[PDB]
Amino acid sequence: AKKVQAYVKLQVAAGMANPSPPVGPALGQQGVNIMEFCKAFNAKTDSIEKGLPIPVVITVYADRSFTFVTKTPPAAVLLKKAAGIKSGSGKPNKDKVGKISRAQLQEIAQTKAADMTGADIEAMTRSIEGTARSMGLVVED
Amino acid sequence: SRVAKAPVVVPAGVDVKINGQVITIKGKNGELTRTLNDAVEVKHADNTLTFGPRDGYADGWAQAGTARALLNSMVIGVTEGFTKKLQLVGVGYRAAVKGNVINLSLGFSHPVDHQLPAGITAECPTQTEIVLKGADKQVIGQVAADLRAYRRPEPYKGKGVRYADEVVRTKEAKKK
Amino acid sequence: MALNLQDKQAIVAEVSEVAKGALSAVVADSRGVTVDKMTELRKAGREAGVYMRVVRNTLLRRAVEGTPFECLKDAFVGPTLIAYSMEHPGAAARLFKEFAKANAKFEVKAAAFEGELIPASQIDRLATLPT
Amino acid sequence: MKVRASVKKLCRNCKIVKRDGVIRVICSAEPKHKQRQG
RNA sequence: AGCCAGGAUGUUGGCUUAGAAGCAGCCAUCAUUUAAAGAAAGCGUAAUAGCUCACUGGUCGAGUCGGCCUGCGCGGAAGA
């Protein structure tokens, strides 16, 4: 790819078709037609699952064409649906929101192993635990 | 001190002569003369120029470092020459060169004609830009300041005479 | 980096890699970013993981102070940023020609991959390695 | 500029200089930190 | 101290979902990729973006940095 020209990382949940109210002007910073985006993104949405918090980088090129490479959903929200605690952090030091098994979080990170920039998966999975400490959890096994 | 002990590499063919307290050098560009402070004992005596804090005077080391940078920049002038790129930001601001006088229409009710001191050949490659060359770092810096003294860059749209690499911190209108 | 042993903790890590060393090369990092950081460190992760030496402390009185141990042919490596690469498993492994593939892959200024030892000469890219 | 009798570095880019006897705190970023005296 | 480099991965984190993405503020104040980079010091953004510093490569080349106790001084310091 190229250097910083006109792209940033945004776009929340993929289930939200045409997120003009939330994102808004960020799409308008460039000449990005949102329906042109929905034409391509929703063409990629119907591949695995619908209604998941997804992150994508809207990389715009000079010839008016734009490409996008998606990524795995946030470990923070993966922490909310896998365990069933939809609140999030809230109060990490006052109320421990939830807890999950090591075996579970390891294989969840193993799939993300091909999506992460790490070398040791054991070290990579405890990084998710570091996020779990940020969300207010207890690593139980 | 750290700059006072640094020898100055004077280029080949460049004439330098130390007449006691006064110094006169000359390269391809021009003749720059300067009188040093008595607290510094300077000696050519070589292929380079060494500086020494003469005895008696207490602040000798401070004065020595000063004198070094002067002659260092003096040999850069007589051999290369200095350039000051000025940019005139703003609609209606045109520059002109007439012999040795710069004509500037800086939005006033009258054109301002600045007189160039000596050896300063100003040139405007563009009507909104002035590439000004010279032979001495001191006076080239001063005349660049004077043209900027006619119109300092206002912090709202950056209108006015500025430098090439000058960054202007623009303020914003209160509400709208 | 606090005291003398702080320098020595790096040198013991240094000589440990030299005590079982093999083919090696060098690439500078004055034009590289964090993007190419994970291109050769993942290459290290392609071998096994982290222990692939890429420690950058090659001062003429630091890493050269650690060269008299072994690999004496590395005396005048001195300046021009040096980043090493070890091959503990696999005598004459792929790590040498990895920079040939890398120089054409987002690395532009790579100090001309001058290399260090084993051809018992100066830099020359060997492609006829025992696979 | 603030003609405060007591001056000190308000930020990171502030720096004390002693021009012509009086102590001045010039600032490289914001003009509001520029002060003179003390 | 300067001159050239990097200054990163999850990470749009959660809370009033109108937004607080190191940068209003509330919690943890992580672990990794590792020569190294605080989930953060300042500037700046509706929010991002963008620019620096922390730390770390090389170059360079000598001592130097932050405070304490004291002598003598400067500012603070304008009236008929």
Per-domain residue ranges for chain A?
1-71, 72-141
- Is A72-141 CATH 2.60.120.200? no
**Within its chain, how far is the Cα of C61 from the centroid?**
18
Residue B46 has a CB neighbour count (10 Å cut-off) of 9
Resolution in units of Å: 3.0
Domain made up of B8-80: CATH architecture: Alpha-Beta Complex (3.90)
Q: How far is A90 from chain C (nearest CA, A)?
A: 33
Q: How far is C110 from chain A (nearest CA, A)?
A: 20
Residue A84 has a CB neighbour count (10 Å cut-off) of 8
Query: Edge to edge, what strands does the sheet with D35-36 contain?
Result: D14-17, D24-27, D35-36
Q: Could you tell me whether strands B31-35 and A9-10 are parallel, antiparallel, or unpaired per DSSP bridges?
A: unpaired
Q: A117 and C49: CB-CB below 8 Å?
A: no
Residue C84 DSSP code: -
Nucleic strand E near CB of residue D3 (< 7 Å): no
Nucleic strand E near CB of residue D10 (< 7 Å): no
DSSP A33-95: -HHHHHHHHHHHHTTS-SS----EEEEE-TTS-EEEEE-PPPHHHHHHHHH--TT-SS-TTT-
Q: How far apart are CA A140 and CA A85, in angstroms?
A: 16
H or E element at residue B32: strand B31-35
Q: How far apart are CA A2 and CA A69, in angstroms?
A: 14
Domain made up of A1-71: CATH architecture: 2-Layer Sandwich (3.30)
Q: For residue C44, which residues of chain A lie inside 8 Å, CB to CB?
A: 119
Tokens standing for C76? Answer: 């005048």
The vertex-B89 CA angle with B87 and B91, nearest 5°, equals 135
Report the CATH fold assignment for B86-162.
Answer: Outer Surface Protein A; domain 3 (3.90.930)
Nucleic strand E near CB of residue A55 (< 7 Å): yes
- Structure solved via: cryo-EM
**Residue carrying the six token digits 């896998």:** A82
Q: Which among A117, A120, A121 is the top mutation candidate for probing chain C, defined by the most C β-carbons within 10 Å of its own β-carbon?
A: A117
Q: Strand E and chain A: which residues 102-131 have CB closer than 7 Å?
A: 112, 116-120, 123-124, 126-128, 130-131
Q: For residue C38, which residues of chain A lie inside 8 Å, CB to CB?
A: 117
The boundaries of every CATH 3.90.930.12 domain in chain B are 8-80, 86-162
Exposed / middle / buried, residue B18 (Cβ in 10 Å: 0-12, 13-18, 19+)? middle
Q: How far is C63 from chain A (nearest CA, A)?
A: 27
Q: Strand E and chain D: which residues 13-32 have CB closer than 7 Å?
A: 13, 21-23, 29-30
Q: For residue C41, which residues of chain A lie inside 8 Å, CB to CB?
A: 119
